Amino acid sequence: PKIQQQFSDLKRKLAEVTEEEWLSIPEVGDGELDMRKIGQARNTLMDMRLSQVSDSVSGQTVVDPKGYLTDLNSMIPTHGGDINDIKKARLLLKSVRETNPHHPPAWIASARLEEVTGKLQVARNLIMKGTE
Amino acid sequence: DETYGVNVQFESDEEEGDEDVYGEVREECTLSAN
Amino acid sequence: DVNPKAYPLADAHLTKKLLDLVQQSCNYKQLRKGANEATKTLNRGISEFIVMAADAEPLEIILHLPLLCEDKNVPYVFVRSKQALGRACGVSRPVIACSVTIKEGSQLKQQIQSIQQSIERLLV
Amino acid sequence: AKLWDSKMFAEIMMKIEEYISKQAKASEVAAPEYRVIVDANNLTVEIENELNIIHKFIRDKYSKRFPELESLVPNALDYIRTVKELGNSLDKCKNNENLQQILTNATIMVVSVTASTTQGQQLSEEELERLEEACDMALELNASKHRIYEYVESRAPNLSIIIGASTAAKIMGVAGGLTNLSKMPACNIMLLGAQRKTLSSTSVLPHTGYIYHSDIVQSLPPDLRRKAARLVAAKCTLAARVDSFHESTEGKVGYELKDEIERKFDKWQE
Amino acid sequence: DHNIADYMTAKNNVVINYKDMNHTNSYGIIRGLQFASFIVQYYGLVMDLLVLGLHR
Amino acid sequence: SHFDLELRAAVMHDILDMMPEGIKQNKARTILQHLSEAWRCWKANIPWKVPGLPTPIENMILRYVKAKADWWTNTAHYNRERIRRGATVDKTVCKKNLGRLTRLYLKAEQERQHNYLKDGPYITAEEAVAVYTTTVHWLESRRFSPIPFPPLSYKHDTKLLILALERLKEAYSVKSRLNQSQREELGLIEQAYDNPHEALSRIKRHLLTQRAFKEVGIEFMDLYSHLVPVYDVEPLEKITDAYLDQYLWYEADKRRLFPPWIKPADTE
């Protein structure tokens, strides 16, 4: 047929609309089945059956969320040391000790920093070096 | 010795190829259904 | 002309004095803005006096404050414009009610007492 | 031990309160009404708690005949009605017309399928009669609750326009009258009727009562419910004051404030 | 652990979104999570058990 | 080729023809914008309903949109067939075809999800219990110990966090042009690098409590043989998922959960 041939029927039907509706057009600027239910029922049935089977299983592990959260909240540190400041102090004290092979205060300060933050093996090695 | 007075240098040193600094190989209840 | 129910209405001279004192109180941190906060100050008994705007649109939203002030023995006045009251309070929005609170050893005590005496004579 | 004891004590208390409520309803056509209104409001909570313990008792007793029914029917009244309708004979899911008045067809299918393979045993006649009397007690308590709610709804045009009539009555009763309500800050009215709700805090809604749990506030996404509460409370306060002087009896102020609230909600949700 | 399993399932059930479209993926895994590899390998182990038979 | 242009022009001419003169001097551009909006809404798979738009014009727009959608789908499929079979093309045509294919695939995926919701699970309870029993039997035969929740003082958490952050960072073959989301993710990874313990506590908190998440953004890598879906996730959830992934894989290897025949293995 044609494009306008297809649209002629609806053009005629559009011819009926009145002038009041013509000029009032807005602008773009502005029983049944609950199909879900049956799926929910089937899901619940499967889940209940699977939990029924799981009841036999024993060795599973599950922690108590409130207990673990309480433990974490307790474990939150109250001091420690800002990491950027700690790294700045580490570089500073490294330069100090390297410049002065004979500053026991410098070696003690470096060891104190390395033991308050981080681990202790590095502090032990640095302090053997400082002692010698 | 108190040894008051200290000089400190900041450098972007410690650049390496990511290999070991020395060429050494540094080496170091169950489930049940009832 | 304004509203018969805003009975103790101040005049232009007393209005100017009241707005100046409210500005000073705001500068001294002795002012509370809003009907809710005025009610809270009245309940806590820390209010020197209450100033309300006479052009509140329903005007029944702040008519509990005169009764509260009578119960707690606090003076109160009505001004004509809420825009002026809001400007004097330090904000750009209109304000319909504000309260001047009590501060120990403040330097505004004499002016507050004079304004209280002036207000108390308007209830005739 | 104290099952029948608590049942009888609640029966007496509900008898007194329902006599008062029915007297007030009949009289519809110094001992104020808001006192009995708040009494009914707390009796509703008492009835709910008693219904909860009765539901627990029924669950424990019936968990030997049809242990799996509790999962399929989580609602309390529905579960009680289902156990009453099924009884000892689980062959009543076939061609049953009463069960269709309590549950949907999907859950009816599920319960019929599960009953065919349940591994439960029969209950003794004494246990059956105990369950029946417990169910009847629960049903009569529910009827009393319905009567209380009817009276509570039947019992300030603007404040009622903004928020229903039940919530208005609740807040005015807890406040202690319209005059007492009119002279409170909005931030205090927002908190009228708020529990403590022990943790076992964000998941508890610490500061919410009688306005947060309202039809117009719960009608929003959760993330917008606190703000809405504030707003509603604010406007409610204004309405209350306008009501305390018996002005705008037609509800014009209430309609205007409700329109403003709706506009704010729309703008929030656009 | 039960909490970890719940977390993984909830993660896999989320809302996809393109430039303008979006839906709620609820059937299959999203395949773009960091543990999708573990999920796929475990499911494949289950499939292996089905195919081979426990004895073999 | 230009069937869409012809269709739009014909639709415009038809709507303007009978439209009265007195108001067409004003409403022509408005109706054109309406056509564009309807087409955009159809493309995005979202409702389009103008309350004040008369029903005959609504029907006209609907017919236009239906015809244009038919042509759109057909031409997208044909162009994909051409490119796949092998035919010289250019960047703009390839990109346009990729966008069209992405939209069509997303429509199909939404249909799939809704059909799943309607038809419920395809696994019968009997099959589910069968596979569950088989799995528990295998695990019991192996004596496998279920993986526990990471303890507070687990030794290796720092190492696992470093590995996860390294894996996340490696995703940047620097082009000098990184979007806001990618830059923010990089900043978050650097912050985690800086402070390990706070991020670890956050991760444990999320693993233990979070059950409602944001959305993910899906795009399609264009291999002419077949498109590949590519998912982007929120940076914080990315961090948490990476940590959980590393932890799960390490512990599964430790317990030897996966038999040797599961491939690819790490040693080959």
Side-chain angles (χ1 to χ4, degrees), chain A, chain B residues 5-11 17 19-34, chain C residues 4 6 8 10 12 34-35 38 45 53-54 56 58 66 75 84 86 88 90 94 97 105, chain D residues 1 10 24 26 30-32 40 67 74 76 87 106 115 120 134 138 143 156-157 164-165 168-169 173 175-177 185-186 193-194 206 209 221-222 228-229 233-234 239-240 251 254, chain E, chain F:
Chain A
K2 241 299 290 292
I3 268 196
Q4 52 194 269
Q5 167 284 334
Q6 301 156 21
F7 282 93
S8 269
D9 155 38
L10 180 53
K11 178 183 184 160
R12 165 174 76 272
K13 196 48 52 176
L14 166 74
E16 281 96 308
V17 73
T18 81
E19 199 281 318
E20 80 171 299
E21 309 167 301
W22 270 126
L23 86 157
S24 70
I25 282 194
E27 86 313 341
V28 46
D30 274 331
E32 311 307 90
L33 313 95
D34 230 337
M35 309 188 132
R36 305 238 166 180
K37 80 176 229 135
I38 187 135
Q40 323 180 342
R42 304 241 282 135
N43 258 288
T44 50
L45 179 71
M46 185 185 353
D47 199 347
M48 93 157 42
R49 186 138 291 99
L50 285 163
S51 78
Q52 249 200 281
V53 178
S54 176
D55 282 358
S56 303
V57 162
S58 79
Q60 300 156 282
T61 172
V62 46
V63 303
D64 192 41
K66 288 305 197 179
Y68 210 95
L69 282 180
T70 311
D71 282 358
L72 271 192
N73 304 326
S74 296
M75 168 215 78
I76 311 180
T78 180
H79 190 273
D82 203 284
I83 287 182
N84 257 7
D85 298 335
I86 285 291
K87 97 196 188 72
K88 164 166 148 291
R90 165 41 41 214
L91 301 153
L92 157 58
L93 271 170
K94 155 181 161 184
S95 292
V96 169
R97 61 174 187 245
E98 171 193 336
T99 48
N100 48 76
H102 262 294
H103 205 209
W107 298 98
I108 293 168
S110 314
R112 186 133 49 203
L113 199 68
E114 280 183 335
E115 65 143 21
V116 298
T117 190
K119 295 186 276 292
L120 274 152
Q121 77 300 335
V122 63
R124 283 156 193 164
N125 302 24
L126 199 65
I127 278 296
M128 182 46 257
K129 185 79 174 172
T131 46
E132 54 186 53
Chain B
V6 168
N7 189 222
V8 300
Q9 283 78 7
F10 304 109
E11 57 279 54
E19 209 64 63
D20 197 19
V21 300
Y22 332 124
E24 284 190 330
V25 163
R26 253 163 59 76
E27 44 182 307
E28 58 84 16
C29 272
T30 73
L31 281 159
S32 290
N34 326 83
Chain E
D1 195 271
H2 286 35
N3 309 286
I4 309 186
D6 283 359
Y7 179 77
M8 279 148 87
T9 289
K11 271 289 290 213
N12 285 294
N13 162 29
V14 292
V15 168
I16 314 303
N17 159 281
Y18 189 56
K19 197 136 62 183
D20 203 339
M21 342 189 74
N22 35 298
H23 57 270
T24 305
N25 159 282
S26 55
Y27 186 18
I29 61 157
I30 276 174
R31 212 194 314 193
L33 316 172
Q34 309 281 321
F35 43 73
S37 155
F38 188 86
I39 281 161
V40 162
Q41 291 279 74
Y42 182 48
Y43 210 64
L45 165 58
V46 172
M47 300 303 87
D48 298 9
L49 295 182
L50 288 191
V51 157
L52 289 162
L54 291 166
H55 189 38
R56 189 52 167 180
Chain F
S1 46
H2 40 280
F3 163 95
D4 79 332
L5 303 183
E6 302 177 359
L7 166 53
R8 186 245 295 277
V11 163
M12 270 276 142
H13 204 176
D14 191 322
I15 182 50
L16 264 289
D17 283 333
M18 323 177 328
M19 142 59 70
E21 166 46 35
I23 182 53
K24 72 165 61 161
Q25 176 55 102
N26 301 35
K27 303 293 286 186
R29 281 75 59 200
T30 66
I31 60 159
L32 166 39
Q33 296 189 341
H34 274 234
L35 310 183
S36 76
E37 197 61 24
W39 177 238
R40 184 190 70 82
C41 284
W42 181 95
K43 255 157 63 179
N45 216 1
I46 54 177
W48 170 86
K49 37 214 182 184
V50 186
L53 182 143
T55 178
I57 296 100
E58 164 163 10
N59 292 330
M60 172 85 208
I61 297 173
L62 290 183
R63 282 281 310 93
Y64 152 74
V65 165
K66 154 58 155 166
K68 198 179 167 169
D70 278 35
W71 163 85
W72 199 68
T73 313
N74 175 249
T75 187
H77 278 309
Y78 158 71
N79 248 333
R80 170 36 50 109
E81 289 318 310
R82 261 186 45 214
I83 296 181
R84 177 195 313 244
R85 154 161 51 62
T88 303
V89 293
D90 75 80
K91 153 86 174 161
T92 205
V93 155
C94 158
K95 179 272 206 198
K96 178 161 296 319
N97 204 42
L98 173 56
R100 297 187 164 156
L101 266 293
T102 304
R103 289 197 167 285
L104 295 169
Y105 173 101
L106 279 169
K107 279 163 168 302
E109 193 66 40
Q110 181 159 21
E111 264 272 88
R112 204 177 62 88
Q113 299 301 325
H114 276 317
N115 287 354
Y116 168 88
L117 288 173
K118 180 192 73 161
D119 286 323
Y122 302 121
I123 293 201
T124 315
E126 282 64 350
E127 313 192 351
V129 299
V131 306
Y132 192 46
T133 42
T134 303
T135 324
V136 302
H137 284 344
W138 170 256
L139 289 179
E140 146 175 337
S141 163
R142 290 282 106 192
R143 313 215 219 90
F144 171 77
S145 149
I147 315 189
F149 199 109
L152 309 106
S153 36
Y154 201 52
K155 285 73 61 163
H156 328 275
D157 287 29
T158 43
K159 302 289 185 332
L160 311 186
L161 184 59
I162 298 331
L163 296 182
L165 300 159
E166 278 179 10
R167 292 297 329 205
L168 293 181
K169 267 253 286 184
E170 283 173 32
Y172 298 159
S173 182
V174 59
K175 313 104 174 167
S176 78
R177 306 294 176 261
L178 82 173
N179 81 326
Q180 157 49 25
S181 307
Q182 190 197 331
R183 144 177 55 269
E184 185 49 278
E185 159 190 39
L186 174 35
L188 263 293
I189 290 132
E190 277 311 329
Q191 188 291 323
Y193 225 143
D194 161 22
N195 189 352
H197 289 225
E198 174 45 46
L200 195 47
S201 196
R202 182 156 50 54
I203 288 159
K204 230 151 288 203
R205 199 111 58 66
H206 276 182
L207 255 52
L208 198 44
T209 59
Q210 197 66 7
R211 305 286 182 259
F213 311 91
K214 310 287 223 302
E215 48 276 39
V216 317
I218 193 176
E219 323 160 23
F220 278 87
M221 218 211 310
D222 189 2
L223 305 148
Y224 301 136
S225 56
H226 65 297
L227 310 194
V228 167
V230 163
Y231 301 82
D232 83 2
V233 200
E234 197 277 343
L236 209 171
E237 308 172 3
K238 264 189 95 161
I239 288 169
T240 301
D241 299 357
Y243 171 90
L244 176 53
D245 160 26
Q246 281 289 342
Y247 168 71
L248 287 170
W249 265 110
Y250 165 55
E251 291 239 33
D253 159 4
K254 199 181 211 163
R255 289 145 212 279
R256 283 185 328 294
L257 162 56
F258 297 118
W261 70 71
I262 287 174
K263 300 300 187 192
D266 310 295
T267 63
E268 60 198 12

